[PDB]
Amino acid sequence: AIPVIITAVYSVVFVVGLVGNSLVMFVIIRYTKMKTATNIYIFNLALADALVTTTMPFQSAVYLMNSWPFGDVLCKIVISIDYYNMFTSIFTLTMMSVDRYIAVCHPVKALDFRTPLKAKIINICIWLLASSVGISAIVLGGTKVREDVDVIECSLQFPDDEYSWWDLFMKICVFVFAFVIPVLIIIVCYTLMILRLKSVRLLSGSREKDRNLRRITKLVLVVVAVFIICWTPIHIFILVEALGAALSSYYFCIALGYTNSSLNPVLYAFLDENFKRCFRDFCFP
Ligand SMILES: CCn1cc(CN2[C@H]3C=C(c4cccc(O)c4)[C@](C)(C[C@@H]3C(=O)OC)[C@H]2C)cn1
Numbered sequence: 001a002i003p004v005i006i007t008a009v010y011s012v013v014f015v016v017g018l019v020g021n022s023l024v025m026f027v028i029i030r031y032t033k034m035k036t037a038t039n040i041y042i043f044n045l046a047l048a049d050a051l052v053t054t055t056m057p058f059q060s061a062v063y064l065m066n067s068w069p070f071g072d073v074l075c076k077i078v079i080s081i082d083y084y085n086m087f088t089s090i091f092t093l094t095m096m097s098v099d100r101y102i103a104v105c106h107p108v109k110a111l112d113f114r115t116p117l118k119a120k121i122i123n124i125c126i127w128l129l130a131s132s133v134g135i136s137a138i139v140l141g142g143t144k145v146r147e148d149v150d151v152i153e154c155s156l157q158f159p160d161d162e163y164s165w166w167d168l169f170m171k172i173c174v175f176v177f178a179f180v181i182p183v184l185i186i187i188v189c190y191t192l193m194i195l196r197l198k199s200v201r202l203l204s205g206s207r208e209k210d211r212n213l214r215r216i217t218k219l220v221l222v223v224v225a226v227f228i229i230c231w232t233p234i235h236i237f238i239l240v241e242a243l244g245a246a247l248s249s250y251y252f253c254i255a256l257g258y259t260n261s262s263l264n265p266v267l268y269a270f271l272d273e274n275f276k277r278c279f280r281d282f283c284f285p
Pocket residue numbers: 059060062063079082083086170171174175234235238253254255256257258
């Protein structure tokens with residue numbers, strides 16, 4: 001047991017992920033060159049990641065001291081931000097996959113569909129949809145003291161009359177509606193996309209547009225794959241704990257889930273040429 005490992009990971013996230021996501025958002029907002037629908041979805045992803053990053057110093061307290069000293073309102077805000085990030089990230093990735101599928105397999109409709117204004121509207125709709133869980137976490141979140149160890153715990157406060165089916169039902173619903181169905185949609189979309197790419201890879205000829213499409217599809221696929229492997233262990237662990245060394249695995253899964261918020265810019269800078277150019281221009285004008 002050495003507390004500086006996960007705490008150092010949390011601090012590295014708290015600084016680097018915040019800086020990178022802020023740079024991504026600033027670059028997307030400023031440059032008219034990079035105001036594209038996929039870039040708008042990337043902006044939403046970076047916004048969620050930066051929002052979840054600000055709560056990193058509060059997250060590390062329940063690991064350093066195993067108690068919540070920040071109060072009820074801060075507990076509510078932190079829980080709401082966590083649920084907002086979890087739902088918004090997966091929904092935005094699903095919409096990115098759908099947009100890529102439309103661009104690749106239905107170019108006739110993608111002209112009307114893939115305008116940046118529709119991307120902004122879809123981002124607002126995604127934030128509103130996830131608010132059904134964020135506002136619920138605001139209402140239900142709270143701090144309850146432990147009567148056996150005098151430890152303050154920050155968690156959702158289901159009625160103590162049942163507080164059992166409630167927790168299991170909410171965990172199952174979160175699993176189904178934030179992991180299973182969106183991942184199924186992403187898998188279907190990318191299976192069709194890969195089929196289309198293989199079909200025309202032999203003799204496609206619109207060099208500039210084909211290259212651009214294949215590069216953005218690559219970038220989106222890599223981002224989705226990184227998210228899936230970063231958030232897969234925590235979902236399975238939560239489901240197993242609800243239904244069925246353990247604490248070490250739990251905290252490792254939690255830490256791995258949070259590090260995904262910092263790897264998005266270090267992926268954009270390597271998978272996209274325009275993002276790399278803009279990062280260089282900002283760092284070294
Ligand atoms: C600092 C360590 N710590 C974190 C917590 C609680 N968090 C972690 C686990 C949860 C979760 C995740 C997936 C499915 C599910 O049903 C619940 C949260 C809703 C999101 C956090 C996370 O995993 O994002 C990497 C939240 C209550 C308690 N201690």
